[PDB]
Design a protein around this ligand. Sequence first.
Ligand SMILES: Nc1ncnc2c1ncn2[C@@H]1O[C@H](COP(=O)(O)OP(=O)(O)NP(=O)(O)O)[C@@H](O)[C@H]1O
Ligand SMILES: [Mg+2]
Ligand SMILES: [Mg+2]
Length: 314
Amino acid sequence: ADVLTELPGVGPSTADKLIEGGYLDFMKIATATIGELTDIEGISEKAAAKMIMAARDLCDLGFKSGVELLKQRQSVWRLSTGSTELDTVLAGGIESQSVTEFAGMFGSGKTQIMHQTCVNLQMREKIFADLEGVVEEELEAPKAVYIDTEGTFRPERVVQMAEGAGIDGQTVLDNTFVARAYNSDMQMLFAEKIEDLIKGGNNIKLVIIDSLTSTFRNEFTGRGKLAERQQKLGRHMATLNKLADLYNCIVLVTNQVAAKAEQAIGGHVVGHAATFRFFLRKSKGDKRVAKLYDSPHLPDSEAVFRITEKGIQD
Ligand SMILES: Nc1ncnc2c1ncn2[C@@H]1O[C@H](COP(=O)(O)OP(=O)(O)NP(=O)(O)O)[C@@H](O)[C@H]1O
Ligand SMILES: [Mg+2]
Ligand SMILES: [Mg+2]
């Protein structure tokens, strides 16, 4: 919480050395390691160790029980997908503090959903938050980050969906950051640089990686390169899960499929890292089916939706 000097043992000099290293929030320090803190100019091990324990304490990161357990869950806000049936399967909508994955064959609607969420983020009526755990100013001027790894981001579609929702398309564009990544290195670096946007005053509440695996699959083709691929993708996923928890934001990813009748690629690393996993498939015409096949507390379920000129509906 911005004022690091409120941390016991931390004076103005230290606070400066810290912000430089990219530490501007209590939680970031509380979850750091003595190593990464000592990597900063004149921050000793004793100090590093001390502020870490102080930050944890300040954020009250201890044992919780009873009602406190429900309170923690109230800090999770949800975003509407534009589909009633889909939102119901999600038990409200897409959850912040988690990674939700949409995998499916070509044209199943993975990118459409990504675009719709950018629009919905700009409509508070589309955001469902418990006032008892999410302060309204935490939702003010929400911004989205779209890491486009295939080059399929379409400003036109965002504007069109915005119109379809009854709001200004230019407003959505002004509040949506897009980063075109040509390989996994850029993809991962962009994800890591999202912190700079937040530090810059942007309230990043939606992070989209479309596609999550296309780059990796094309860069590590040999089966004798499976381990290589998994390790890098694993670090990427960890970065994603941490920013989702740390900044109470939604992380949305898309995934392609492969035969054996099909399954999402990315291996176990993506399998374990994603909290919610969906399989998108096409039906008659503009109809689509979204099958939730993995989550920590929701049963497997299907939702029928459509992709139209307005965007996602039903
Ligand atoms: N403006 C529009 N109006 C109505 N339908 C549209 C419009 N734009 C796209 N679609 C539909 O969206 C489908 C493609 O959605 P898309 O989100 O790109 O699929 P995808 O799963 O991400 N495929 P891919 O990127 O290859 O993996 C089309 O084939 C169109 O039927
Ligand atoms: Mg999480
Ligand atoms: Mg796509």
